[PDB]
Copies of this chain bind each other. A is one copy, B any other.
Amino acid sequence: TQSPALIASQSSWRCVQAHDREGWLALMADDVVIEDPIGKSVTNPDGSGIKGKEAVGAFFDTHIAANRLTVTCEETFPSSSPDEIAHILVLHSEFDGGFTSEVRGVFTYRVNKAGLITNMRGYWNLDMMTFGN
C-alpha cells in the first residue's frame, strides 16, 4: 500500500484538477506552511511561506483556481520515511487574460502522523518559467 506522503501529494493534485477547494484544504494540517516556491516570489510574497488554513485558502483562490493552474507529476522520489516525499512537477497556469506560463520544479512534501500536509516546498523561481500564446 501507498505511503501517507504519496497519498497526500497525489490527493493534493487530484483536488487541484477537480477544482475542489474544500477537498484540498482538508488535506492540510492546521499548521501547514506552503512555500511555493521557497523564497520571495509572486506566490510567496514575504518569502517565509503561506501559513495556516485560512491564508492557504486565499492562496488556492488566487494562485491555483483563478490562474487555471494545472499540475502534472513527471517523476516521484520516495524517501526512507513514509511521511516525506519529493516529486518533479510541471505547473501550467494563465495570466493577463489567457497568456500561459509553465515551470518545472522539485516539490517536497511532509505529512504528520495523521497524514495531513504540514509542508509543501517548491524549488523554482520566476527566471525558470517558460511562456506561451
Contact = CB atoms under 8 A, between A and B. Distances in A.
A40 B80 contact: yes
A106 interface: yes
A66 interface: no
Interface stretch (A25-33, A55-63, A118-126): A118-126
A84 B128 CA distance: 15
Copies assembled: 2
Contact of A123 (B47, B77, B83, B125): B77
A49 to B, nearest CB: 11
Contacts of A124: 77-80
A70 B48 CA distance: 34
A38 B82 CA distance: 10
A108 B122 CA distance: 11
B84 A39 contact: yes
A44 interface: yes
A115 interface: no
Interface string A80-93: 11111110100000
Nearest to A78: B125
Contacts of A37: 79-80
A100 interface: no
Interface of A: 37-41, 44, 47, 77-86, 88, 105-106, 108, 122-128
